[PDB]
Structure 1
Amino acid sequence: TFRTLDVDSITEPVLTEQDIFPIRNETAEQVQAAVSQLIPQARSAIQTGNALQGLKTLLSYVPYGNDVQEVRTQYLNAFVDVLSNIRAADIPAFVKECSTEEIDNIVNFIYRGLANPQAYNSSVLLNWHEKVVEISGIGCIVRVLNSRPDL
C-alpha cells in the first residue's frame, strides 16, 4: 500500500532537458517561415539537376524544437528526397568539401531519417552513412550521440 505512491518525483524536481541545452531564441513563426522559404529552393535545385547545390543550400539552416514537429517533418522529407536524388559517384568530393559542423548536421539528419523506414528509402541513407563515416571519421557519430534530443 504505502510502498507504492512514490513521492520523490515532486519533492525534488529533477533536472529537465531545457536546463541542459540552450533555449531556442527564435520564435515558431520565424523558423516555420524560414523553412517554408528554404524548401522550394531545394526542390527547384533538384529539378534542374543540381542536387549538390540544393543540398548545400538546404544544409545552411537547420530547425529544431519540441513545438516545430510538422515543419521539421517537412524539412526531413525534403532533405531525404534531395539526398536520394544525388548520384553516388560524386559523394566523396561533397563530403571532403564540407565543414565539421555541416557534416554533423548531415549525419544527424540522415540518422534520423534511418529511424522511419516505413516511408523512406534506407539504402541511400545507409550508403551515405558508410561513406561519411569512412571519410570524416567516428567523431561525427560521437557528435550525434551528444546532440540535442529535439534535433
Structure 2
Amino acid sequence: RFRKVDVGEPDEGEVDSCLRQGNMTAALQAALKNPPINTKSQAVKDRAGSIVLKVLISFKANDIEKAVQSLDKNGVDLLMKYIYKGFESPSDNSSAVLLQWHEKALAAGGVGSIVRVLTARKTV
C-alpha cells in the first residue's frame, strides 16, 4: 500500500504535372518545397510522405545521380528525412528502391546527414 500510488508526476498537382511532363528532376524538387514538419496534423504528413514516395519509385534508377546532386544540402537532408519514413511502410517494390536512394543521398550528405534525421525534433 504505502508504495502503491503513483506520486510526484507538397503540391500534388505540381508533382503530378512534373511527372506527367517527365521533368523528373523538377518533380523531386517540387515535392521538397514545403514539408509539413511545421504542422501538427498527421494526415498531412502521411499525405506529403506518400507524394514524395510517388516520385522516388517513379524515378528511373540510373537518373538518381542527376536527381540527388541537383538538391541543395538542406534539400539532401530533407530527402533523408523522407527516405527513413518510407522504410516504415514496406512493400514489394518500395524498400528495394528506397535502399538505393539511401546510398546515393548518403554519398551526397554523408553520415552527418543521418544525424540530422535522428536529432530533428520535427517529423516530416
Asked whether the two chains share a fold, i.e. TM above 0.5, the reply is yes
Q: Which residue identity is paired with 2:27?
A: G
Aligned to 1:115: 88
1:43–1:119 Cα change, 3 Å = farther
* More deviation, 134-143/119-128: 119-128
Q: Is the CA contact (8 Å cut-off) linking 1:51 and 1:83 kept in structure 2?
A: no
One-letter code of the match for 2:110? G
Query: What's the TM-score, normalizing by structure 2?
Result: 0.87
Aligned-pair identity in percent equals 31
What residue is the counterpart of 2:103 in the other structure?
A: 130
Q: Distance in 1 between matches of 2:8 and 2:93?
A: 42
Residue matched to 2:117: 144
- The structural deviation recorded for 1:67 is 3.4
RMSD: 2.0
1:82 corresponds to which residue? 55
Once the two structures are superposed, residues 3-60 of structure 1 have per-residue CA deviations (whole angstroms, 9 ceiling, x without a partner) of: 1222121xxxxxxxxxxxxxxxxxxxxxxxxx4xx11110121112122211111112
Q: What count of residue pairs does the alignment treat as equivalent?
A: 124
Q: Which has the larger radius of gyration?
A: 1
Q: Is the contact between residue 25 and residue 67 of structure 2 (CA under 8 Å) also seen in structure 1?
A: yes
The residue type equivalent to 1:102 in the other structure is: G
Per chain length, whose mean CA-contact separation is higher, i.e. which structure has more relative contact order (CA < 8 Å, sep 6+)?
A: 2
Gaps of 5+ in 1: 10-34
Deviates more, 1:108-117 or 1:59-68: 59-68
- Aligned residue identity for 1:8: G
Per the alignment, in what secondary structure is the counterpart of residue 40 of structure 2?
Answer: coil
8 Å Cα contact 2:28/2:67 also seen in 1: no
Q: Which runs of 5+ in 2 are unaligned?
A: none
For residues 91 and 39 of structure 2, the distance between their equivalents in structure 1, rounded to whole angstroms, comes to 23
Map of 1:103 onto structure 2: 76
Compute the displacement of 1:95 (Å): 2.1
Question: Shift of the alpha carbon at 1:118?
Answer: 4.8
In the superposition, the TM-score normalised over structure 1's length comes to 0.73
